[PDB]
Structures are given as structure tokens and as C-alpha cells.
Design a binder for this molecule. Structure first.
Ligand SMILES: Nc1nc(=O)c2nc(CNc3ccc(C(=O)N[C@@H](CCC(=O)O)C(=O)O)cc3)cnc2[nH]1
Lengths: 557, 557
């Protein structure tokens, strides 16, 4: 046959999230329905199971992204199916996808094939309106700033230094750079600013790293909006915003229980950028998944260079977390591109090029080892991947020195990854973890980037532009020196040079600019231009998206 | 004596809505819950009951609003409640408040005192996401207009003629006048535009006028966004955005079931502006209520010169409704302001200013007669009103030919509205209505404006600026002249001059500008400057707002 990811999403039987919440010991009144098959879970399921056994934590990451695509979520879902098939109490924790791209290049399944989270349609759109709550908390702050300038600028802000932008969850490039506040004294103060996609919001970040609402509230209050003419940081604190922002977020703070194509209890909650932030789902979803399972499968954005590292250094750091196993996804087609084979050429097998690419994966694996974490490997399998190829790889992974398996979940459900399932258990009974943070918050900023760039990206050194040192000297000086560091750089290389594939060496990194996220609580060094507002294409999906008399949706997927 | 509004809402015991729904004959499968105390309800309910007769339709409206306040919704809910107490099968239909006011001026009850729909907190905030859906349906068209220009401008829009703005549901004045698409050839096409509050979006209007999702989609396709360099109109249809917008509104098209304090079912659905739109809740909600119930209370925005007028001449026109009674809500105080007494001396008895002001009420009563609907007056009782005052007000209402009933629903819930309920029932059993709209569509725009102006406002004639003349000329030759006309003017006067209280004589209306909503399907003459995006005050309510660890919300109401 020939089924597509939408049909496999419709066709499937979903169980009322209510009775899955019972199949997890969640009380009737800790749920909060959204139709029969979506629901939010209250902040008491943690608060009451406050001390209970935290089950085991299984971060899935990937090798360096490629035009091939690797499907890091699928393999992360169809593994959760396996663990449950082998009758284990296992939850997946995923990220809420942005609305905007469903109308740009099309929406895609949570995971894929036969390793999906459902109902897919809802997840891609409004879902439980989590993003909307972010949007409005960001935008009210924005409004509150501009209003304050209107009301006489009591705090004496220079409007030209305001760093607080606006958000919306569409790909709209016409809003990147705009002028607001025009039309004279009645209509505000003229200034330059713009919009970023809502999922790039510091508020989106805070959500994903607040422990509870009261934590979220205060983080907000810390957020910088800009400076006074005198140069003194002004905060959301200084504008008494944080109350009203936490209120707008009252329900967004509750993680959303949904399910697998095979009824495995899933959370979906948060979803920030993996570059200017850390690309994990929220702390709240996983720490609730902890007290509720013995086995929590999760994930982080982009390659293991960025997602993993930040998962470990910022997520786990802040959350006292202690990740046990870790998967790393890889395709062979992917590693052949890392071996310098263009995409029209992966149609054939290149066994020589696959020995080349591997250096990527191995670099990753060594990095995992570096946190005191039991690395383990896994292969997404495809129609074209010959057994000569698969084996070549197979054998170079123990020749590297950590477990390996094969998954077929795209096509075989939580069976293809049954093999990989045992490995992790194998790895959890036999292989403890010895988890430390790859750096320490007491070092000054340059050392923190250094120890990151050096050991993980495998660079010899790091450089700074004029305004990179100017910014950093300004920060250490304002006191924000002791923060973690989130590395805004390209995903497709270890280096900032996006064309440098495989495992490049002898290069160095260059920090062009440095930004602050006081509310999220980290420093963001930038190496490229960052696209914080993608744009629609020449022939977008919004043009052919239709819904007819019956609710039948053509074009969306 | 009475508790404040907010606390009354919390301590109310609400019934599971699914219960209310099965009580009314809605099947469980036509219900999508949002907690225990909210639900979206299927457009299928209406579809299977299309043939059943309608219950009675009872419109609530009021006299010319003043600073002194009249409390129209208070009456609507309390009227609903009394009807329920008298054993009648009744629902009330109300509009969803805009989120933004909750942070500038303060959120307020849906009603007030003991006459309220609940859960209060939700209905002010995100409720069920209806406005968010409106926000993104709207802004997707914005982004598609902008993408089209960016991608080679095939339709040949003159970007400077674009009328389709952007929307957001906060009071942000700085967003009134903006320039977008800056930064260079890669960032879109530079142009002047702005934001209006979401609830003033034409898409909000359409929702409220649509008969279903397919009618809604077809309307969307008729939205005019701007013109070509040739002066030909360009529509959303031409941009092929309708399916998408229609998709964003798939859940939004369903009315929301909620309840009054005393558990009377209530729809809350849509909620447009009442000056540039018709200030009514969705046809969809109201049409469903008539099938489910024997009596349906609904209300309209602003005074009877505006809401009532548009309710009949637009809402009922499209829906083929024939209202059976209309209740005008008035207070001793507002009448005295209209009779001349300043806000601070409204407490001092003054039968003469009360007789003078009564003219305002007399003129409204009279108007409602021009639509063939029998009128009952509700007097919102107030503690400083003397017996002499109230008595005079009764004599005057009877002299003027309408039943009158004192209402203390605010104070005493459904019990304070029992005489009023009885008067309405009395009017319904003995004075059946003879509904007809004030005007035929085949008149000219200028004919239609003058008939409203003179019949309802008691205007002498109508003036038009040169700019308004060309608009009307343009619109008529574009074939939009047989549309309804929707006056945007001040609500604080029958005249276009908000300083003219009571019943002004020898005045003219000046139509300065004329705009079009071809989606909603009407023409919008504007008289004063119309504020489609209000600003925050000196201190915004947001500066006091907080929620603590318990979740105790202070500063909000
Ligand atoms: N905002 C607000 N709205 C209200 O309606 C309101 N009402 C009260 C208390 N309500 C009232 C209402 C009417 C009379 C009153 O006029 N009493 C006459 C009735 C006359 C008649 O039946 O004709 C009496 O005889 O006591 C007293 C208290 C207090 N605060 C309020 N606040």
C-alpha cells in the first residue's frame, strides 16, 4: 500500500485522555478537558508526588542536521511505543510546533509514519492555545513599554535602546523591521522595532524553564526591556508587568496530555528556538513525566552540538535533573551528505562516503560521554539503505565504543524500535550515569564560551568583534556575568561556517554579537545572522489549504 | 450589603455544562468541553432542528449611555434568570468581551452583582480562543497581502491603497500608525499601515454575521484588502486566503455554552464593535438558542439609536428573525444627566431635570415602535432614587405608551426581575410584534443614511465631505450600493456631537468618511473620528494585577 502521515493520523483510535490520566494515577480533578482527546494537567500532580521516585530520564538527540532530514522525533516516539510494548510505564515529552509554518511550507506530523502523537491537526494549529498565551504576555509587555513612554517616560528610558520586540506566530517578513508610534502626540512615541515569530519569545523560553507559575512570574519581572538614557537597565520588574503576564499564562503553564498512535501517554509542552534558546520541551512536562513514569523519553532541537549540550547545561542544570541514558539519531543518507555526497546522489549507495561522514556522529558520541552520560546509538532505516552500508556503520560504533541498534518505526510502529528499546534498559541496569555540567557558573563569560566551543564543537579558539567585547564588558559589569550560555550559531556545522560538514578541524569560532536573556536567565552569543522571523515562500500552503462542507481538510499536510 | 462583583462570581455554584446541554436536548457527541463549565456546541444541533419553530426573541437595549452608567447586561442576565424562575425555557446570548480592557480600565463582570454569566475569569481572558482564532485568521491575510507584494506583485496592487490593517487584542496606541516592510529588498515592501483591536476586525464582524463555516468562508473571499494601480479592487478571494482563514476558524464557528449565576444556560459568541460594526453576538449562537428554548434574551451594543437599530436592520435582516419584544434599560441618574444635571449632583432629587431627560427615553421608545416591536422599559433601581423620582418615571413611561418595571436584579438576582419578566410575558401574550426593517436595500447609500439619521437620530439632514462623496460614488459604481449601512458615530448623543445630551433638535449629521466591509456585507459611514484601537490610561490596571502561589488573583477587578 501507500498511506500518508495525515491518514495514519485520522484513521487511528485515540483513547480519551481522561482514562489514560487514570492509567497514570492522575485524579479526575487534576485533568481539564479540551474535547475528549486533549487535556491540561494541573501543577499538583508534581506538587503532591513531590518526593516519589523520579523514574529514569532518556534524552533523544541527533547528529548534525542535513538537507536529507533525519526525523529526530519519530525515532523518539516509536521508541516510547517499544518501551510500553515491553509493558513499561513510559511517557514521551515533545515540543508544541509553531502555527505559522502550516501555512508556509506545510505542517508535519508530531514524529511520523507510525510513531506519531495525536490528534495531529490540533497540535499544528491552536492546540490548547499555549502559544497565544505567550504571544499576549510578550505583547502586553511591549504595549506596557510604549504606554510608559507615552505617559511621560517616568523611568527615563531611551526608546532607541529598547530591545523588547513584538511577537506573532505567522511567517511574516514584512514585520521584521518596522517603525511604530507615529501620528503625533496622541499616538505614542516614534521608534524602530519589529516582530519575531512567537516561538522565539523570551516568554516562550521562560515557560520552558520555569519550575512553577510563581517562578514564571518572577523570571518575567527580571526581563530587560532596554536602558535609560543614563544606561541603567530597565526591567519588566520596573514596569510592574509580571503580575499581568503570569495571569495571561495561568493555563499555558499546565502541560498538555495527548497520545501516541498506540495510545502511549504523551506530553506536549513549550517549544522554543534551539539557537537563541535551548530547543527543549518544558521543565514542567518532563518533571511531571518523572514522578509519573519510571521511563521518560524526551528531546532537544537541532544537532547534539546545540540541543543536547543546552539540554544538559541549562535545562538539567536549572532543574537538578540527572539524565540517565541518551539516544543519538542518525541516518546513513545523512552521513553520506556529511561525506560530501549531494542529495540526488544518495539514490545510490556510497560505502566509501559513509566512512567519511561518520566522524560527525563519533564527535557527537564523544561529547555525550563528556557529561558523564551513557551514550547509545540508533539508526533510522529507509528503502535505499543497503545492508553493506548499515553494517559498515554498525561496526564503527562499537569501534567507537557505545551501544547501537536499528529502528524502523516510520514503518513498523513501536516494533521496529523494539530492538533499540531493550538496549536502553540494557544500558540502564548495566550502565549508570555520572552526570556533571560541562562548565561552572562562576567562570566569567569568555571562559564559558571557550569551554563550550573548544571541547564540544571541536574548535581551536573563539574570537570577538568590537561590540562583542563592548556588550560582554557591559554585562559582567551589570552583574549578569554568572549566567549560563546559549550558543546562537548555525546548526548544519560544528563550526559557525555552515558549509563546513563532517567533523571540521583547525577552524575557530567568531562571536559577532552578544545578547542577554535575563528572564530566561541566560546569555546568548551570536555567530551568524539569526532568522527570528521566517517568511512565506513564493507558492505557500495557505493558497491551497481548503476545508469543505464536511470538515475535510485538503492541503494542510 | 452586597459583595463585590468578582467574589460573587467565584462562590457561585456552577453545574457541569454537559448537564445543561443534555437538559436542552443537545447530544453529548455535539459537545466539546473546555473544563467542566464551558463547551463549544456543534453547528449540527441547529441543522437537525432547522424545522422546529423559533422560541420568542427578546432584545435588550438601553437609552443614550452617559458617564453615570445604565447596566444593560445586568438586566439581560437578570431578565433571563427571572424567566427561568417563572418556569420558562429560556437562554441568554451575549458577546465575548475584548481581552485588552481587562488591563487598562479593568475587566468587569458579564453583567454585575447577582446578574452574571460565569465562569467570570475565563470569559474576560482567553475564554475558548475565539478572539485568538479571529486575530490569526485576520493577520494571515495581512501576511499574505504582504507576501504577495514581496513575490513579484502579480495582482498589481498599489500598496499605498491597502485598507486591510492588522489586529491585536490589547489597547496599544503606538500600533495605530506604523510603517512596515523595511530593511531592504529581502524584507518585504515598505508601506504605511497599523493595528486595530481584534474585536474591531472585519473577521470578527463576519463571524457574527455568518450562517456557518461555509458561509463564513464565502464572506472571507469577498473581503477587499486594497486596489490595483488601475483602481480595480483586490479581494481575499483573489489572494486565495479563504480556505486558510476558514481553517483557522474551524473551532471558532461554534457557540460557547456557559451559565448565569443561577445556572440558566447562556451562549457567549462573537463580539464586534458597535459603531463600525453592528455590536451584536453571532447569528449562529442566537439562531441555535431559538431552537433549544422557548424564549431567548439577547442584547445589543451602545444605545438603542445604534445597537437596536443594527440588531434589526442587519442581524435580523440576514437571519430572517422577527423580534417579539424589546426591553429598554434606563436609570433615574442617566436621565437626569440628560436633563442637564452634572455627574456630581446626580444624587440630589430633581423631578424637573428628570422630566427634561425623559425625552431621551421617550425618543427611544418611539424608535422601537418604528420597527413594529412592542417596548418594555426596565428601570435599574439605584439606592439614591427617591419615590417621587421613580413614580414620576412610571407615569412618564405609561404616558408615553410603554409598560415599565423596576428592576433590582443587580441586588437580588432573578427575584429582582420577576415583575419585569411578568411585564414582558404580558406584552408577549397580548401585543404580538409586526417586525420590518427601517429601510429597503434598494435605496441609495445616501437615502439609507438619511432615513436612519432622520427617523432614528431626529436629525434634520445629512452632510457629506468631498472625500465621503467620492467614496460613495466609487462604492456605488463598484456595485456595493445595495448594501446595509452601519453608522459609526458617537454613542453619547442622538447627534454626531457627544456634548449634546437628551433629545437634541435642529442639528445635522456630517459624514466625513465612508468605508466598506464587503465580507460582512455592509457600508460604514463615519461621523466623528472613530477610535478602532484605544490606548492604555495614565496608570494601567495592569500595574496592580497579580496572582499569588494559591492562585489568588488581586488587582484585576
Ligand atoms: N452599580 C450599581 N448598580 C446598581 O443597580 C446598584 N444597586 C444598589 C442597591 N439597589 C437599590 C435599588 C433601588 C432602590 C429603590 O429605589 N428603592 C425603592 C423602590 C421603589 C419602587 O418600588 O418603585 C424603595 O421603595 O425602597 C434601593 C436600592 C446598590 N449599588 C448599586 N450599584
Amino acid at each position: 500500500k501507500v498511506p500518508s502521515d495525515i491518514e495514519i493520523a485520522q484513521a487511528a483510535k485515540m483513547k480519551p485522555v481522561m482514562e489514560l490520566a487514570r492509567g497514570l494515577g492522575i485524579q479526575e480533578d487534576e485533568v481539564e478537558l479540551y474535547g475528549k482527546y486533549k487535556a491540561k494537567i494541573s501543577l499538583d500532580v508534581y506538587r503532591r508526588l513531590k518526593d516519589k521516585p523520579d523514574g529514569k530520564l532518556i534524552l533523544v538527540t541527533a547528529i548534525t542536521p542535513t538537507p536529507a532530514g533525519e526525523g529526530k522525533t519519530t525515532t523518539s516516539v516509536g521508541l516510547t511505543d517499544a518501551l510500553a510494548r515491553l509493558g513499561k510505564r513510559v511517557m514521551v515529552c515533545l515540543r508544541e510546533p509553531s502555527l505559522g509554518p502550516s501555512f508556509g511550507i506545510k505542517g508535519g506530523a508530531a514524529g511520523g509514519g507510525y510513531a506519531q502523537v495525536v490528534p495531529m491537526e490540533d497540535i499544528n494549529l491552536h492546540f490548547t492555545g499555549d502559544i497565544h498565551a505567550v504571544t499576549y504576555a510578550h505583547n502586553l509587555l511591549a504595549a506596557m513599554v510604549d504606554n510608559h513612554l507615552q505617559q511621560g517616560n517616568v523611568l527615563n528610558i531611551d526608546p532607541r535602546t529598547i530591545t523588547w520586540r513584538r511577537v506573532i506566530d505567522l511567517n511574516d517578513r514584512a514585520l521584521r523591521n518596522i517603525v511604530i508610534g507615529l501620528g503625533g502626540k496622541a499616538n505614542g512615541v516614534p521608534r524602530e522595532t519589529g516582530f519575531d515569530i512567537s516561538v522565539a519569545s523570551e516568554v516562550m523560553a521562560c515557560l520552558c524553564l520555569a519550575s512553577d507559575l510563581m517562578d514564571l512570574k518572577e523570571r518575567f519581572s527580571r526581563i530587560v526591556v532596554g536602558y535609560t538614557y543614563d544606561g541603567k537597565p530597565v526591567t519588566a520588574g520596573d514596569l510592574e508587568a509580571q503580575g499581568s503576564m503570569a495571569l495571561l499564562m495561568k493555563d499555558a503553564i499546565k502541560p498538555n496530555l495527548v497520545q501516541t498512535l498506540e495510545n502511549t501517554p504523551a506530553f506536549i509542552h513549550g517549544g522554543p528556538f534551539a539557537n537563541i534558546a535551548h530547543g527543549c520541551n518544558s521543565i514542567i512536562a518532563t518533571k511531571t513525566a518523572l514522578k509519573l513514569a519510571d521511563y521518560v523519553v524526551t528531546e532537544a532541537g537541532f544537532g547534539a552540538d546545540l540541543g543536547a549540550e543546552k539540554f544538559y547545561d541549562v535545562k538539567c542544570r536549572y532543574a537538578g535533573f540527572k539524565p540517565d541514558a541518551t539516544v543519538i539519531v542518525a541516518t546513513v543518507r545523512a552521513l553520506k551528505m556529511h561525506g560530501g555526497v549531494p542529495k540526488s546522489d544518495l539514490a545510490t549507495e556510497n560505502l566509501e562516503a559513509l566512512r567519511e561522514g561518520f566522524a560527525n556522529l563519533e564527535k557527537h558520541i564523544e561529547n555525550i560521554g563528556k557529561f558523564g552520560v551513557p551514550a547509545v546509538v540508533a539508526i533510522n532505516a529507509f528503502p535505499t539503505d543497503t545492508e553493506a552500508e548499515l553494517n559498515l556503520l554498525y561496526e564503527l560504533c562499537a569501534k567507537a565504543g557505545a551501544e547501537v541498534a536499528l529502528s524502523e518505526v516510520w514503518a513498523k510502529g513501536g516494533e521496529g524500535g523494539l530492538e533499540l528499546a531493550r538496549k536502553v534498559l540494557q544500558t540502564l541496569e548495566s550502565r549508570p550515569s555520572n552526570f556533571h555540567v560541562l562548565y561552572n557558573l562562576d567562570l566569567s563569560i569568555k571562559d564559558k564560551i571557550a569551554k563550550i566551543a573548544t571541547e564540544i564543537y571541536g574548535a581551536d579558539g573563539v574570537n570577538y568583534t568590537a561590540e562583542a567585547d563592548k556588550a560582554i564588558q557591559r554585562y559582567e559589569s551589570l552583574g549578569y556575568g554568572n549566567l549560563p550560555v546559549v550558543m546562537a550559531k548555525t546548526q548544519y556545522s560544528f563550526s559557525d561556517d555552515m558549509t563546513k560538514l563532517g567533523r571540521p578541524r583547525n577552524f575557530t569560532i567568531t562571536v559577532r554579537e552578544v545578547r542577554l536573556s535575563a528572564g530566561a536567565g541566560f546569555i546568548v552569543p551570536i555567530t551568524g545572522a539569526i532568522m527570528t522571523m521566517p517568511g512565506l515562500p513564493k507558492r505557500p500552503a495557505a493558497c491551497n489549504i481548503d476545508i469543505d462542507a464536511d470538515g475535510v481538510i485538503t492541503g494542510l499536510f
